[PDB]
Write a protein that binds this ligand. Sequence first.
Ligand SMILES: CCn1c(-c2cccnc2[C@H](C)OC)c2c3cc(ccc31)-c1csc(n1)C[C@H](NC(=O)[C@H]1C[C@@H]1C)C(=O)N1CCC[C@H](N1)C(=O)OCC(C)(C)C2
Ligand SMILES: Nc1nc2c(ncn2[C@@H]2O[C@H](COP(=O)(O)OP(=O)(O)NP(=O)(O)O)[C@@H](O)[C@H]2O)c(=O)[nH]1
Ligand SMILES: [Mg+2]
Lengths: 168, 162
Amino acid sequence: SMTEYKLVVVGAVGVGKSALTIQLIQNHFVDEYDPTIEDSYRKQVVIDGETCLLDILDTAGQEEYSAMRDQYMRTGEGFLCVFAINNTKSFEDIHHYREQIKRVKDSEDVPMVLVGNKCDLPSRTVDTKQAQDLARSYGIPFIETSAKTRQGVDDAFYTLVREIRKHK
Amino acid sequence: NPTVFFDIAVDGEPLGRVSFELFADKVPKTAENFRALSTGEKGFGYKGSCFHRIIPGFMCQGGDFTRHNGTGGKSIYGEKFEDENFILKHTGPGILSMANAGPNTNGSQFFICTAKTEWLDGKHVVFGKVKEGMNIVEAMERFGSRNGKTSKKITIADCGQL
Ligand SMILES: CCn1c(-c2cccnc2[C@H](C)OC)c2c3cc(ccc31)-c1csc(n1)C[C@H](NC(=O)[C@H]1C[C@@H]1C)C(=O)N1CCC[C@H](N1)C(=O)OCC(C)(C)C2
Ligand SMILES: Nc1nc2c(ncn2[C@@H]2O[C@H](COP(=O)(O)OP(=O)(O)NP(=O)(O)O)[C@@H](O)[C@H]2O)c(=O)[nH]1
Ligand SMILES: [Mg+2]
């Protein structure tokens, strides 16, 4: 049977966690905002010649439940850390999620990918260079995406699988 | 204080009637929104809409009659209206309270608590409580799940003012 990868998508409310995941799984985008409680998805893919199963946990951004993330962080193998390039606050919130994952897993070596979503939008407030520098400071890849145009969507998830692969 | 009712159906099969007291004496604008939406008198309202999020141990949420998918809803004052006050608390099962997407975004979505939900105090406007039919709300719970997706369509087949 094929290797399964437990991916978790995290980030502030409205950054595009669900829109990214539903583009991956269903190949469609809607501008409507349906706030997530918690959703799980499965998808078979081929990455660098190798077939595998993505088990994706799409989490809630709600800060009021920030104390209920520990179990899914323990269980997850890799994390897609999403902010929106037109929302400076979501970029600040990113540092918090990374520190929280590191603390909960008790490791400096957690597979993750920094994702700057909504790159189709003109109202950009977070510079490409800002995110590359943060990613570099973390030792993780940075990918620009648009759930709306599909730019970078596969690449973001597939890169995260590569990060998990190198860790194992 | 006005009283309204919902006749609940499950996949079109009748379940029973839930009635609510609306605290017009304490939150008149929010009570009036819910009353008017229950009668349909503005030309739109709850009749036919579903409970799209049911989480046993917590609440039953509904009221999206514009998009029928959990994302919509509108008030009788415009798409959204401000938080009237936070005088009343989420004290236990039966409390009726407005759903929202942050401060001052009340539309038509609402929830009925099936337990005390105190951490929602000061964030969601409480404006009513179940008067009769709490056993109908309790019976709705088994059609829900941990993340709230329902296993049968739970609809407001009819509603009005008593
Ligand atoms: C961390 C997990 N988690 C929990 C929780 C906490 C502790 C233990 N277990 C859980 C669940 C079962 O673990 C999977 C919650 C919860 C709530 C949210 C996101 C995640 C949540 C969430 C997303 S958006 C919102 N909260 C407010 C939401 N807004 C909209 O729907 C806007 C569209 C319309 C206009 C809204 O007003 N309500 C009306 C009040 C109840 C509220 N929904 C809701 O569903 O609470 C679910 C509840 C009660 C279980 C809390
Ligand atoms: N233009 C544009 N809009 C996007 C993009 N990704 C998401 N959105 C929009 O942003 C809003 C929120 O997206 P959503 O995926 O629900 O965000 P979330 O991070 O899942 N939110 P939550 O934590 O509450 O579940 C929606 O209106 C959605 O259409 C994107 O790449 N471009
Ligand atoms: Mg989401």
